[PDB]
Design a protein around this ligand. Sequence first.
Ligand SMILES: Cc1ncc(C[n+]2csc(CCOP(=O)(O)OP(=O)(O)O)c2C)c(N)n1
Ligand SMILES: Cc1ncc(C[n+]2csc(CCOP(=O)(O)OP(=O)(O)O)c2C)c(N)n1
Ligand SMILES: [Ca+2]
Ligand SMILES: [Ca+2]
Ligand SMILES: [Mg+2]
Ligand SMILES: [Mg+2]
Lengths: 823, 822
Amino acid sequence: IEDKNARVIELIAAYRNRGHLMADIDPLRLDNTRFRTLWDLDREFKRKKLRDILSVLRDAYCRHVGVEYTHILEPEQQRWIQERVETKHDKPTVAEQKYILSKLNAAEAFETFLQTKYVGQKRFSLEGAETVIPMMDAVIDQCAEHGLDEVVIAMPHRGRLNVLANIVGKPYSQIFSEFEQAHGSGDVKYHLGATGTYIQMFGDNDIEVSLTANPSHLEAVDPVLEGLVRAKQDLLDTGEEGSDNRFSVVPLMLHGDAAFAGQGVVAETLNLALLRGYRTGGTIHIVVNNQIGFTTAPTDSRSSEYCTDVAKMIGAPIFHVNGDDPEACAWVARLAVDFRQAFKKDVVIDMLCYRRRGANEGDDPSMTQPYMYDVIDTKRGSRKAYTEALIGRGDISMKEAEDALRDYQGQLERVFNEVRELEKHELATAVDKAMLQRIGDAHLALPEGFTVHPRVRPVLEKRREMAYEGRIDWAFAELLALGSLIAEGKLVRLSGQDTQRGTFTQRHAVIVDRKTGEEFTPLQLLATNPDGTPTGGKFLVYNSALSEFAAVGFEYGYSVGNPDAMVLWEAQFGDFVNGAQSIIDEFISSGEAKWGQLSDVVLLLPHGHEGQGPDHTSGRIERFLQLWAEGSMTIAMPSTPANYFHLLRRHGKDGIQRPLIVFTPKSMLRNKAAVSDIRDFTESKFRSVLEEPMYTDGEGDRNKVTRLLLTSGKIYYELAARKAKENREDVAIVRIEQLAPLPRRRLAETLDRYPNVKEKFWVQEEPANQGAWPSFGLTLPEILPDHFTGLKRISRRAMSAPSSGSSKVHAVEQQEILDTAFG
Amino acid sequence: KNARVIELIAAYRNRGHLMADIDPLRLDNTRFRLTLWDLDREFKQRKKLRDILSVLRDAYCRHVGVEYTHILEPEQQRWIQERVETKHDKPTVAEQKYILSKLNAAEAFETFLQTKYVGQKRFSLEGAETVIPMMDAVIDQCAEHGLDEVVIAMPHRGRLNVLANIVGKPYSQIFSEFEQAHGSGDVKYHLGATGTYIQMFGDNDIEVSLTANPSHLEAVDPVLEGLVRAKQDLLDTGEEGSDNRFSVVPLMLHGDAAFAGQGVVAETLNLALLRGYRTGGTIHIVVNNQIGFTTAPTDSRSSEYCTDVAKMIGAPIFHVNGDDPEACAWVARLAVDFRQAFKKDVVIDMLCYRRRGANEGDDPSMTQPYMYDVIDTKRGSRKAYTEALIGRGDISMKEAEDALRDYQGQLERVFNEVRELEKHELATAVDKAMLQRIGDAHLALPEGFTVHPRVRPVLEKRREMAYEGRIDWAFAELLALGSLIAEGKLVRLSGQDTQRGTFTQRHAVIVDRKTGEEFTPLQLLATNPDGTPTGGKFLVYNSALSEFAAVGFEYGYSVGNPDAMVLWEAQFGDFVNGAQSIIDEFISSGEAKWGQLSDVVLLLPHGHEGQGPDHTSGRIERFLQLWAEGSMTIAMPSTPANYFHLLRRHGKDGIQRPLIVFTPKSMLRNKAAVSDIRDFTESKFRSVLEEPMYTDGEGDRNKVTRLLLTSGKIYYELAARKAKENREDVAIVRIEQLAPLPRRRLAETLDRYPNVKEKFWVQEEPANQGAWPSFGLTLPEILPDHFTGLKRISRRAMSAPSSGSSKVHAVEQQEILDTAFG
Ligand SMILES: Cc1ncc(C[n+]2csc(CCOP(=O)(O)OP(=O)(O)O)c2C)c(N)n1
Ligand SMILES: Cc1ncc(C[n+]2csc(CCOP(=O)(O)OP(=O)(O)O)c2C)c(N)n1
Ligand SMILES: [Ca+2]
Ligand SMILES: [Ca+2]
Ligand SMILES: [Mg+2]
Ligand SMILES: [Mg+2]
């Protein structure tokens, strides 16, 4: 009947849409509520019997795999999943089953060794979650089967050393070398990066496997992994910026259930997944879902059914899999890789498991989760269970079962023995005029039929004029630096919020056709020599998403992935970079000292007191200076276009991997005094300390100076204009262009040229507790006591905010600084 | 045939929104691009296919795109389905005229603002004015449900319009001393406000408020939630209340690019149904003008809609055409009804356009030439809706002309009113019985309650400490909070694993070994011995794994209820940098910027113990750098009793100021770090502490030639070394209150050591960290006769808070102790 056939259609849709709500995914079965005509079952429907349709639906959607995919908007993706999930799956070969068991044996023997040999390692234990090892193995093996080049992993602490041994393939001698509290991070080896080669067992392919470094800040590494992968993909000419659509470098990202639901950086990183500036062709996510977060239950950790519900944001398919079924876990891992290869989109695997040990050393987890731990106490391991089931199903003989147990024992013996044996042993930046002229000419070498917006056309003509006649402004000097690096063969990646045009309408790195909307990148012409051959260089410029945390994390990641790239991230205003504070604190400022991991990332932070309020005034110079330690970063605030040009060229050509923090201008972009001569680009270098041009080039007399004003940034021009207005020959203004490391020798040598100075003042726009004064006021009299003893401060008064909220108050305070400096 | 119909119905319900006419600009030209005899056949409840298809097209493919089949609760899917799939009778002309009056009021405000003042184009609501009759419908529907208050959080776009036409603030207050291509134009764009909404066609009124915010888009989102939650707790409504009304409604506005890119959005959505954070569902309005400064949506997000993040918590989503203010008002009322029925978030994606540019003097056709050639052909929302009402025969020409008179009068009124405005232009000690009561409370277990065998000694020890002394840090904290509850104060404590405590020291909540039932010993102190309530309460929760949203929430909670004691605890101080935007933009600076006060406490476990650079520092140097006179109190107590007095002073001083506490980890179990009963019953907070051998023992201060100034747990190590070597020539002085510096108490303490020849600031932290960067510069300036020649003893300056090796940590710690006694 038509009514009966309709009930079947509704039944099929119910299993496809909501079957996952009844699938037997929890190996602990904590929730019992979850589970709570006969003649029609043998009737054929449109041609299969109802019982056979219902058996296929129960096997596919209500067994050990919960499939969520009907939320996906692309019908072809829903169809692809449906077809692969709704078929009579042939059980794996005994060889495949034995191989999964061997990986479970290796994982368990590793955990047993680690928890028996050392005392304080329980909090990092993978016990109850060992099925993640044959699962990761299946991901990597499937990537090798597709002929891909590398799998890059990011993960937290749980099972880290097991992943090093059984996935990366690192030897025990390297893993437990100089191996080391009830809480906190263990050995530094729980944080370091690693590289290895994975060799297929039943295939003839190999693939590179790497693991990126990370802090204890859960999920903070997520955008770093994406950036590192994208840099590697651009190097291999694969993916978005490549010749092929393979995206042959795969991000494999591990997570914990509580961190995946609560950390905002997860959503920000998922949001990058299909962006032209940030896509990596889909990430394979594995959530180690042990249904606990330290002592916190999932009902206090999230407001949704699953810890993975955030991934619905980008229409990713989600697979909830029972961690006690390593075959279903391996099968889902392979399906995930196939989906990622077919659609270049993220796949999330929610592996339901348990945490056998506590949240900290000496923890009795039944104190806060008595019910969960009374169930965990009855649980046998996933290895013993999978071995028991294979004999139960008659898949392996009793002899084969004992050999598997002696493989376990041999694996345990080997790591004890190997660690026992280990314990027994224990450049010029100036360019030629022709280079400047070429970059100028590039702004007018428009494609045939291209229509420039009438307001952009004068910018291009003025850049040709500047290249040939001088008075080069800040925005053009930046493009002269990047353009000349591209001409020399360097990859330049520039990104940030509205960075193609520039927040202050100054950059125009990308220009838009007035009639078609087609994008044109003038600096990209520098990637080709006049002979028509490539330089090897490239200009990659993007408008970022409205993120700071993920975007800064990505760019840091990108510089790690390709140390030969020039990577710049620009804040809309330096004031918004505090949204990426975790990246600044945990990776950029400290990654080198903590993990030996190097980055040459540039942060461009528009900075300056101009009356636009406390969120459009400061990049927090004082915070970056406080983070600095010898050799960790370079911190600068250039006052001239040419000095900024030389700063960027020195950074890209010095052969050193060190982050550069630049406090960049806003109104000073259009200050007509803030322009440079051609000779400043062709016959000079970066100057960490600058004197007034009247003393280095003019008829100024340094011996008339009794008051020395030390400063940095745009306030120089205001100080210099007041000096000229009042003909103050008794006053000299010295700029500190490089704030960190302090240019001690150049500063001492410059000050020695003013012998009649009776008083020295550090002049700054920022409040007394901000800017360079908190560090300079303490460091300058200590590093140079014969020069800075008695150094006094001229600044805004100390404030709890970077500035006043009133532009009227700003103007009064600015004038007060100028009147004090010349009082 | 019947099967094809079932599939057709599901296709409209699930994907009809992909074909709905939601974009007023119709930028995507590919968006729109079994038999006719079956159309007249009745299907199964018995309706013709033509009728089923008309209802489905009207409900899902007109000016409203409905997303709801992702919702796992079947009763919620059914509720939406039933209200959306009905033959909707067109509104009454009076209702249409009311919607027009709100568009009249919205456009007259924008015309005035963009004509009277220069530099206002980047904040313009032009192209998005339909958000005003939409917000009006939200608030009017909340008043119709008899609710108490609507609290709004929004960015700059249409902020003053909302002040005038939603909050009801007069023009004289909005434009008072009203003050440039970029940034924030006026402080009025950031300030909080409060008003009363009076219904037009009803007899209800409702309070309407707007919370303060920085320019950091979406950062205010968790702050709004905390604020509303505190107001709900005060009204005894919602989760911690007698009724399930949740009578205070969060109304949260957003921009399309910020809603998709900011992680704090997901973190705040994640709080929506949590017992410690739920507010009964938030009404979200996304002002989706399909642009983010100069950035197109394809570079801003990886999903079809800017609102796709809201699917995380199964919120229903309504995409509505901003050129249809009737559909916009209808969806707003439906959203309020859903929120009231299910106590869950509702998201309204209002598709509109941004008439002006991203900054003053911007020509947005430079970067979006196609969008702006379409915007240039667009007539305003008010003129379009007026023209539509004329064509549909809903209003006569006289009625349309009277609507234009109403518009013209509203525009004249603002100009005139602003023209007229321009013409005029405590003891913290408790009694022994209080300590004994808090001790006894730990053993006053409910009938049949089974204590975990490892928790029972903690309870018994607490009874012992209360009566015999040697009170440890963890108990001293509960003595402070418990005594405040006994005095009638609401105490809210939360953070990651805060019920048990990260270091298994707190046990604020204990769990029944057999049933899992929670017991809160301090909640017994909310009742007097005679049985009457004190008016106090203990609200303690395990937070989600968030820092940004959790810190934002607690800050907002203290703003919502200034009489509450609100404490947020970091698992380790090292993770608080994930909440840097809240520290920088609200906690440290809200008072100076907006006059907005908070008494929030941040508890940051801190100390060098060899657990690595992410389990060592709460970054004291960063909080000290943020501090300015009167903004915050910053402390690092060394004794349980001093921490007790610090919390009691904070809760009872009648001052709304954040308190930053650097709390211990191993020092929780240090047997020397214990206090006597008399320290709680006959003392007070001590900003400076001397060694007990000089204040209570036989020590001689005149023998001291070397003074060691320090803070925190390193004191005990310095004191133990002094004892071991009998170093009478050395004295150790602790600075318990780091900010504001206790200048007088410090000077008076140091005057008691006349023979001191050298002074050293001793700290565990690297030289560029801890208190030395600020103290090394401030102490010789504020007290030159005491600290000229002050020298530092510390770890060497580092780019990380510590070494990654516990072996390196131990060597460096011993080096500090040997230098201090060298
Ligand atoms: C950003 C951040 N916040 C807090 C912590 C402290 N912390 C360490 S483990 C833990 C609970 C983690 O739960 P989950 O994500 O489910 O992982 P699991 O330990 O269960 O594998 C927390 C809150 C952290 N390391 N990082
Ligand atoms: C956290 C943060 N990052 C960056 C900015 C700078 N910013 C100001 S407006 C803008 C674009 C906003 O787009 P959208 O959210 O769609 O709002 P709209 O201006 O279109 O209403 C940005 C990136 C900011 N204010 N806050
Ligand atoms: Ca370099
Ligand atoms: Ca207070
Ligand atoms: Mg977990
Ligand atoms: Mg927008």
